[PDB]
Amino acid sequence: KIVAYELKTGGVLLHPIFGGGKEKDNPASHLHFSIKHPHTLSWEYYSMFQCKAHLVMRLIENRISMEFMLQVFNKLLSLASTASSQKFQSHMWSQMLVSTSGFLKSISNVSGKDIQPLIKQWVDQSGVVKFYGSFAFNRKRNVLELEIKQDYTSPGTQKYVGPLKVTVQELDGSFNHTLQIEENSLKHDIPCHSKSRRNKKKKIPLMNGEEVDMDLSAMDADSPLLWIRIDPDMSVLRKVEFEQADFMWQYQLRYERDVVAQQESILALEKFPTPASRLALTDILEQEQCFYRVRMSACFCLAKIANSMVSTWTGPPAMKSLFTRMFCCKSCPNIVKTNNFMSFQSYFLQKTMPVAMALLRDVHNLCPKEVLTFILDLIKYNDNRKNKFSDNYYRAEMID
């Protein structure tokens, strides 16, 4: 919501500052007034105001303990509930106006850190920051060792945020984290992995706990890297653009411990590729206990990539096999029908998948005829009151 809106429009700024004395001081007057007034704004603006409100409190997590947040808020409500419910202390009562300045003061009283830079970055420069953190590859048996460059410039609505850090996963190793700077024409290193060699023998030297995975399938002559990340806990308002080997994206989709990483590799592999191995790893991702909505956007991945399968119809008419191999009512002799609820993974998944199946088109007349008749058959085979769950939205998305 936030990135889309402040690239549609200008910033969503959190003033302390007036234009007092008939002054404007409003670059964010890309449409309208904001400074002293509620009733100028748009619901797009007011909504994104609340959204930036969420995420700037996440930045205050990112500089300050949650326990300290409990401390701050308890001090707030202690002073307020103390200042309430009395005989009206005359001249001594407005402590329930607990606005920005003294609140900030109370924060720094709990822990005085450099959060006024946090303010003047995010509270007082309403800018979203893209990132051209450009992947380079040192220790590609390189003398220079595990290096990647930092880059950014994109005006219209830009902002330059420097000193932060970087989160990288090795093959089976350290979450490497690396500092950042301003003056952003930068080149930086990685706190290097070991010589991950003889990796047929180094099968799993402890990827992340007792996770179990083996592929030499990537460009694994000299690839001791697995995944790039900047701030997986989503600190900076970001829109990160970079490039890896596609193997690394797909293998991240084999597993990663972030839904963030999973759906962003979902988007990155929604752009370009079509190997059938992509389809394979997609379907593999769809059939486990991983996540619900991951699988919904994975369905839409299959939609795009099988739409790229016009001359490259290598795989089947896709995803019929997914209703085959994942759905046994009474072993389901060729058609899945009945009572497929109480397991709400499957609820969302059946709710979603035939839409992406109805997307599957290859250019002769885009011809989803099998899918057409199949979906009509899905609409046939709906349940009685054996499902206790009002077979409603399932109808709705089959209709969609």
Partner: protein, 52 residues
């Protein structure tokens, strides 16, 4: 046995599973479209094309 002894006739197994639920669901579709046609020509009607 063709004259003396006798037997018993049950004569209706009809237990073809997928065919059974095909029968039931097809019949449900029938009753759908039937009541649709009924209140279609019954009540206030507006169309998709002109005069359907």
């Amino acid at each position: 046995x063709x004259x003396x002894x006798x037997x018993x006739x049950x004569x209706x197994x009809x237990x073809x599973y997928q065919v059974l639920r095909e029968k039931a669901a097809s019949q449900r579709r029938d009753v759908e479209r039937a009541l649709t046609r009924f209140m279609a020509k019954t009540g206030e009607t507006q169309s998709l094309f002109k005069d359907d």
